[PDB]
Amino acid sequence: RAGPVTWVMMIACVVVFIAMQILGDQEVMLWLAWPFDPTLKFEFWRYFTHALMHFSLMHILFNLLWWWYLGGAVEKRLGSGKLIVITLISALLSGYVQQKFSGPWFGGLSGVVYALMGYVWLRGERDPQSGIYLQRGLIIFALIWIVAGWFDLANGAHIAGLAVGLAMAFVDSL
Ligand X SMILES: *C(=O)C[C@@H](NC(=O)Oc1ccccc1)c1ccccc1
Instruction: Answer yes or no: are the C-beta atoms of 67 and 10 closer than 8 Å.
Output: yes
CA-to-CA distance for 118 and 76, rounded, in angstroms?
Answer: 17
Half-sphere exposure of 145 (CA within 13 A, CB side): 18
Q: Is 106 left (phi over 0), alpha (psi -120 to 50) or beta?
A: beta
SS3 content of the chain, % helix, strand, coil (to 5): 80, 0, 20
Segment 132 to 171, residues that bind ligand X, using CB under 6 A:
142, 145-146, 149
Closest to ligand X by CB, 24 or 149:
149
Closest to ligand X by CB, 14 or 40:
14
- 130 is known as an active-site residue: no
- Which x/- pattern over 63-92 shows residues binding ligand X (rule: CB under 6 A)? x--x--------------------------
Could you tell me the smallest distance in angstroms from the CB atom of residue 110 to ligand X?
Answer: 2
Could you tell me the smallest distance in angstroms from the CB atom of residue 162 to ligand X?
Answer: 8
Q: Which stretch binds ligand X (CB under 6 A): 6-14, 45-53, 84-92, 112-120?
A: 112-120
User: How far is CA 13 from its chain centroid?
Assistant: 11
Greatest CA separation found in the chain?
49
- 110 is known as an active-site residue: yes
| Active-site annotation holder among 56, 102, 158, 173 | 158
Closest to ligand X by CB, 19 or 139:
139
CA-to-CA distance for 136 and 35, rounded, in angstroms?
Answer: 40
Binding site for ligand X (CB under 6 A): 58-59, 62-63, 66, 108, 110, 113-114, 117, 142, 145-146, 149
- Give catalytic residues, as residue numbers: 110, 158
